[PDB]
From Swiss-Prot, chains A, B, C, D, E, F:
Name of this chain's protein: Capsid protein
Family of this protein: Belongs to the Leviviricetes capsid protein family.
GO terms under biological process: negative regulation of viral translation; regulation of translation
Subunit structure, as described in the record: Homodimer. The capsid proteins form dimers that assemble by group of 5. Twelve such pentamers are linked together with free dimers. The homodimers binds to the viral RNA via an operator hairpin, but also to many other RNA sequences in the viral genome; this interaction probably shifts the virus from the replicative to the assembly phase and ensures specific encapsidation of the viral genome.
Main function: Capsid protein self-assembles to form an icosahedral capsid with a T=3 symmetry, about 26 nm in diameter, and consisting of 89 capsid proteins dimers (178 capsid proteins). Involved in viral genome encapsidation through the interaction between a capsid protein dimer and the multiple packaging signals present in the RNA genome. The capsid also contains 1 copy of the A2 maturation protein. Acts as a translational repressor of viral replicase synthesis late in infection. This latter function is the result of capsid protein interaction with an RNA hairpin which contains the replicase ribosome-binding site.
Effect noted on mutating residue 78 to A: No effect on the organization of the T=3 capsid, but with a loss of thermal stability. Complete loss of infectivity
A GO MF term: structural molecule activity
Main location: virion
Entries under InterPro entries matching the protein: Levivir_coat, Phage_RNA-type_capsid
Keyword annotations of the record: Capsid protein, RNA-binding, T=3 icosahedral capsid protein, Translation regulation, Virion
Consequence when changing residue 82 to R: Complete loss of viral assembly
Pfam family, one: Levi_coat
Length: 129, 129, 129, 129, 129, 129
RNA sequence: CCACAGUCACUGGG
RNA sequence: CAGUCACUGG
RNA sequence: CCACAGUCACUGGG
RNA sequence: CAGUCACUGG
């Protein structure tokens, strides 16, 4: 294998797609970013460690830029107003087989499938009701 | 409407599908569970709070169980051999429009699409390289 | 370029091959792990450091597990009945050229070549006689 | 029968071969030494012992010398400018069968096979990258 | 791709060229060295860290050795008579686009072009006047 | 000689070139700047001193303006968001001949040649991977 | 941070 | 030196 | 806040 | 853990 390759983060249907590509590997922490100023980029980082004797833990972080009214290549302050941060921590017991792990991934995919509660709430600046 | 509906967390092609349903909203934490005993159930929770004066934070949790039947005191009980824990926090600035948020949902969806790096590594019990 | 890739640790023909893959590279310690349950996986770690003003030191560690299924209370878990632990330390002075190093590697390879005393002894639960 | 015989430690084709031969076997420590000046010879030692009730432990040591001629006061002496020191410890539980051991040996051989990460790194005065 | 490749540090027209290659990435410090003994090698290291909330800093180091053969204890050893140390730190604001950065690379390249003031002074063991 | 002359810092191929010219010599510290407001200029400074008994040290500093979305002649704040700083310190042992120094310069040129790792990483808002 | 020093991913000084 | 071994104990 | 830990809307550590 | 390493020191 060798999974550290570029990929499509935001699929806008061929036209207007956001691709992120390998940008760093310092400390086993893999990083991908879109072709932008780091202040306006789409960043993705991932790493794995054995958190305890019983578990392994994947830490995945994603940064998404606020695009509405954005000024490409510009200095936008304050940073906190122009960026969204996603922090994911996946804990998997050392007994999990590959199939067990496939199931876990499926569950994650299902959690965010278009039309489901969570993605629907987020995409609508809403909570659950 | 109401976005607090049931949905399928794990899609196995209509046969062996893990569907999860609304089970609680106490203390502002929306909860869903699979049609199982509370000891062997898949659990999904979600909550939104206004973290800072200018941020909103979504806390989503998913628990994937490895179902098993244990024999305690000569008696057989439905239990979970172990559980996988997904913990994700999403911080979005209040200046994010709905389109801005759809961008975030698409990114999260892209992040886990079959074939991409992260889901590949996870399903293979490996890191990125 | 990268030497932190997956490789075949155990060459059992072209089928029962044990392949080990990059898992984590934190704190100067490269770690490879075979696929499936971490609990039953092969592990390989490696690191180099300047042990003294004149010497560089390598520390390689390998774990060979004896795969087994543990059952307790009627619950089956993939585990390792036990593990064989290989721990080696290689010290090389900074005056060693690439040729000198190639020589060192050859000696290591020869020491373990099929037919030779040490490997023969080990493979037969034996010592020297 | 005897496995305490001479063998080729360094296979440099069929000429510049470094052969090491039995030298002494006192106190459970088998020792091999290449021919000529002891001062410039290759050394290999090996021993097994029951380290615990459950484990047997092997201790292999190898010395690769950098041949050189020292001159002092006009007196020439064959010496070793410096020496590379390999020290390995292999622990194997008493439940290991001959098959289990053969497997362990294969893993050791694979770890050092030409082309693989560890040997490549060592042979190039390099680490992992 | 992967930008961690070998390159020629000193171009002497294909004959007497000093080429340097990846040798380590431990602790997030990318390292390259020339095909020499660690004691006589050319060394290049590079690292990026997010210095401030809005800055990123590249730390690049280059070590140019003056190779020599010293006689210590009547024995001859490959050593370095002395070393020249280049230490450079580049701080770039996160608002810099890729074009902004290309500008920086072009400037650094221009700074050292044959004929220009700085490289002229350095090569002549003189200051600017 | 007399190397304190104007030169092309950024070579954009005849059209759109950035030239810097002598602007100060206070304290032996030579300075060049582009024809801009000092807040938006390209600045280059260089100086030499004998740092110790064994070494001489060249301190070279370069400042590059962020051009994307820049407003020529305008007041851009905060300064830190609009500027990149390069700090170079070159240490050369007093034994270095002119030829030794030419080699050092070549190594610097090679380090930053178009297409090589470092310049490629910088120009792409990336690290090494 | 330093036109601070060194034997330089380390050490020492402002 | 010992251990289910980048960790612990002598 | 943490590529902090867990038995995980709870507990413990920076 | 370190060392010209079945030995020594932490």
């Amino acid at each position: 294998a060798s999974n550290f390759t570029q990929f499509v983060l935001v699929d806008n249907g061929g036209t207007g797609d956001v691709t992120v590509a390998p940008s760093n590997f310092a400390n086993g922490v893999a990083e991908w970013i879109s072709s932008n100023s780091r202040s306006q980029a789409y960043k993705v980082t991932c790493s794995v460690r054995q958190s305890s004797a019983q578990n392994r833990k994947y830490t995945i972080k994603v940064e998404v830029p606020k695009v509405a009214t954005q000024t490409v290549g510009g200095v936008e302050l304050p940073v906190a107003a122009w960026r969204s941060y996603l922090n994911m921590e996946l804990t998997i017991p050392i007994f999990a087989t590959n199939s067990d792990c496939e199931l876990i991934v499926k569950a994650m995919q299902g959690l965010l499938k278009d039309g489901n509660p969570i993605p629907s709430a987020i995409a609508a600046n809403s909570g659950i009701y």
